[model samples]
Target chain A: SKPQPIAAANWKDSLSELIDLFNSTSINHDVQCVVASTFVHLAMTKERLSHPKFVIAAQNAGNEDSLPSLKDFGVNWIVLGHSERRWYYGETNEIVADKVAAAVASGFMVIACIGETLQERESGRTAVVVLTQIAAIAKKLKKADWAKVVIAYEPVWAIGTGKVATPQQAQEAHALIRSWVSSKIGADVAGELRILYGGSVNGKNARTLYQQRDVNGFLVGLKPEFVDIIKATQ
Target chain B: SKPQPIAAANWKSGSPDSLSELIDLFNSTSINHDVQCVVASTFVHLAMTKERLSHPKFVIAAQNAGNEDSLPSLKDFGVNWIVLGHSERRWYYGETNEIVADKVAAAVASGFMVIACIGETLQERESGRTAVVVLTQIAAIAKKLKKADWAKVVIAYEPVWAIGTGKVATPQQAQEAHALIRSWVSSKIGADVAGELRILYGGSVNGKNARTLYQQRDVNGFLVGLKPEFVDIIKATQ
Candidate 1:
C-alpha cells in the first residue's frame, strides 16, 4: 500500500506566528499530514485554525501519565524520546517505553524517536543500538497499537548539525529497521509500518531520501519546506 | 518599616479550570490586607491567568522552573515570579541544591522574582540538623546571586515533615528558625538589607495559626499551598 508522505515539524519554542505561517502556507493536497508542536494551552487555538490534514502535537508531555491532558487540549499526537530528551533529561529506553504505553492507552498517536549516537555509529553498532531501542518499545506494543505508533529514526550526530546521511546510508538504516520489525511481527505488519527519517532533513535532500523504499516520511526540525518536498514526491 | 504580606499559591498539577476558578475567587474579594498575591501555576495556566486577572494586587508565577528556556516563556507571558527549590521538586525530580542555584541565578539574571525554598526533612529535623541544612542550602543560592539579586528573592523555610502533613512548627520553633535565617542574612549582606529581606513561613500554613505565625519578628509572610479555602488564610493576615 502506498501511503501519503507525512511532514511533521518539531517547532520547539517558535513563536505562534511562525507556526501559523507554516500551517497556512503548507496546506498542499499532496501531503498526507502536516503537524506542529503546540503548547498545551495554545492547543485550543491550534485546533480552531488547523487544516483538516494537520495534526497538533506536543514536544514533550513531561511524563507519560500526563497524556490525558493532551486529549483534554484536543491534541491527538505527541513526539517522545527525542535525542535531546535522552541526552539532557536522562530519558532511558525504559522511560520511553512507559511513555509509549501511556500514549497508546490514552488513545494518542506517537512519533516515537530512536537512533544511535555518533560514537555508537562509529563503533559499527548502529543497528545493534537502534534495534535495542526499538526492542524496548516492541515489548510494550499491543497488536492494535502498532498502527498508531510511528517510528522516527533521528541520528543524534546529524540533528541540527547540518550533516545528513546519504540516501543509501538512510535506506540501509531504514531497511534494517523494517527487516527487524518484519522478523519480529511478520512481513505484512512491517510493510504497514511507517518509519520516518529525521535529523537535518531538508527540501534539498528530501526528494533523494524519499526515493528509498523503507524511508516513508520525515520528522523535520527547522526549515521544513513541506510544499517543496511534497511537490518533489508527487 | 512594615512590608506587605505575601500570599503565594503553588498549584501543583491542577487543571486549567481550577486555576481560573481560584483566580476569580481571589479577585472578587476586596482584600484588606496589604498583600502581594501571587498564583504559581502550571505552564498551561500562566498565559491564561495573566490575561484574565487584571487586579494589580495579583502576579502570575510559574510553579517551579528548572531551566533557562522556561524563563523566556514566563517573561513573555507576563509571569514575574518563580518558585524554586520546593521540596516536592527536590524529592520527586531529584533537583539538587546546585540545580536550584543555577535556576535562581538565571531567574535573577532575567529579572524574575524568586521565592527560593529550603527545607529540612523529617529525619534531619528529628536529628536537629535543620539549621545546618537550611544554612547550607541558603549559602549555595546566595553565593550564586549578586547583592542586587537578593532584592528579588524571598526565602521560605519549610520543614518537610510539616508540609501537607497538617503538622506545623510551634510558634517558638518557627520563630527560632526565622531568627537564625535572619541573623545569617544579616551576616552575609549586612543589617539594613537583612531587615528588609522577607522570609516566608511555609508547610501547611493556614488561617487559624497565621496570626500567631505572623506575629513573629522574622515570619514576614507565607508561601501557601493551594486549597479551596485560601481566602480564610488571606483574611487571617488582616
Candidate 2:
C-alpha cells in the first residue's frame, strides 16, 4: 500500500493557503487521508474549501467519546488516545479506555496508542505494559467493536525527546502489541488491524519510521516551514 | 536568522550537534534564541547534544528565578535556589565564602535550588575551632541570605572529603555540626528563621551507611554524589 499524507497544520491560519496549494496540485481524489488533530484546524480547512480527496482527522478526541464533534465539525475520521496525550501528559489508563470505548461506541474509527517506556524495554516488559494498557481499553469493547480500534505503537520516551527507536526496536514492539490484540480480540481481526507509529516522526524520518512491516501510516506533527511533509512520505 | 535547512544529519552525535548546527547556520556558535520558540524540538535538539557544543558561547552561566519548566530551558540561565545547606568554612577552598558569594548571585537570578556547601576544614576541626570558624564565615552572608532567599537557599553542610572522598562522618559528628549551624541562625537571625532553614548533611552519605547518619533529628537531607549514582539518594535520607 502507498503511504498516506495527514495534514497537521493550523487550518484557521493556513487553510486558505493550504487549500490553494492542494487545488494547485490537483492530486487524485480517490484516496482519503485522515487529518484529525484539532477541530479548529479542521473547521478552518472546511470553511475555506472542503476537499473530497483528503479526510479530516482529530489528533485527539474528547475523553467522553462519541462523534458528537463529528456532527458539529462535519468530519468523518476520528483518532482517540494519541500517544502524546497519554504518556507525556499524564492521561490515566482508565481515561484512554473510556475514550476508546466511547469513540467506537459513538461510531468514530479509533487509533489508540500502545507502547512501552525505556525501562519497560530494557527489562523486556513490552508485552506486560502494552497488553495491560490495551486490555484495559479493549476489554470494554463488544465483539463488533473491533472494527473501531486502530492500534498505534508510540514509545513514550521518543515522542518529544528526539530519540527515535531503531527500526528493529519498533518492529518488535509493534509485533508484540499486535500479537496481544490477536490474543484478546481474536486472530482474524488482529490480522486486519491497522497499526501506525506516532512519535517524533517528521518529514525526514517519516519513511524510515514507517518502513517497519507493521507500520500502516503516520500522524505528523511540528509542521516545518517547508510544506514538503506530504511529499516526504511519498 | 532565516530557518536554514539543518544539516543535522551531517553533525556527529553527543558533541554539541545543535550548538554547532546553530553556528554553521548563523556564523557564530551561541544560544541566543528567545523563550517562546525554545521549547520542544529546539530544546531537545540542544540537550541531547550538549557535549558536542562545549563552546564558551554555548555555556549557560545565568538562570532565571522560578520553577516553570515550560517557560524555556536555556544555558547560563539562573534560578533563585535549588536546595540550601550550611556549615563552617575552615579553609578558603571551593567551600569558602568568596566562592559561594559568586554562585549565590548567579543562583538568585536563575532561581536554582542552590545547595550551598560549607564546612570546617580538617585543621580547624583538629584545633577545636569548628564553631568559631563556621560562624565567622556564615556571619558575613547572614544579612544577604536573609528575606525571600530562604525558599531558594538549601544550606548543605558538605565538607571537602565528605563530598569526593569516601570517609563517612559519625552521627555525633553530624549532630554537633548541625547544632552549631542551627544555633547560629537563631542567634544571628531569628527563632522563626532558624526553624525554617533546610539544614542538610553533606558528609560521606550512602544507602547502607545512611540510616545511622539520618538518625540525627536535625539532619534534613543528604548531599551525596557517588552514593546517589551507585545507590539511591532516597535510601540515604530514609
**Total backbone clashes of model 2?**
47
Off by over 4 Å in 1: A1-234, B14-17, B164-167
Candidate 1: give the clashing pairs.
Answer: none
lDDT of each: 0.76, 0.54
**Residue-wise C-alpha lDDT for candidate 1, range B1-238, written one tens digit per residue:** 5566787778866322267777778778777658887778777766687778777678878866766777977787677899988988889999889899998999988889999999888778888898899899999998898787788999888877664332346878888988999999999977877988888888655555778888888887788766655677666665
lDDT of 1 at B66: 63
What is the Cα-based TM-score of model 1? 0.49
What is residue A22's positional error in candidate 2, in angstroms?
4.0
The sequence of per-residue lDDT tens digits that candidate 2 reaches over residues B32-112 is: 322111111233444443444333322221221223342224424321223222343334233556545654645555545
What shift in Å separates residue B198 of candidate 1 from its native position after superposition? 0.6
State the lDDT of candidate 1 residue by residue for A1-234, as single tens digits. 336667676665444555565567645455656465546545554745456766777766756446777688677888889888888999999889888888888888888999988878888999889999989998998777888888889888665565667777787788889989999977877878888887665555666577566777888764436545544443
Worst 10 residues of 2 chain A by lDDT: A3-12
Q: What is the model-wide C-alpha lDDT for candidate 2?
A: 0.54
Candidate 2 error regions (>4 Å): A1-16, A26-31, A63-66, A87-89, A222-234, B1-238
TM-score of each: 0.49, 0.43
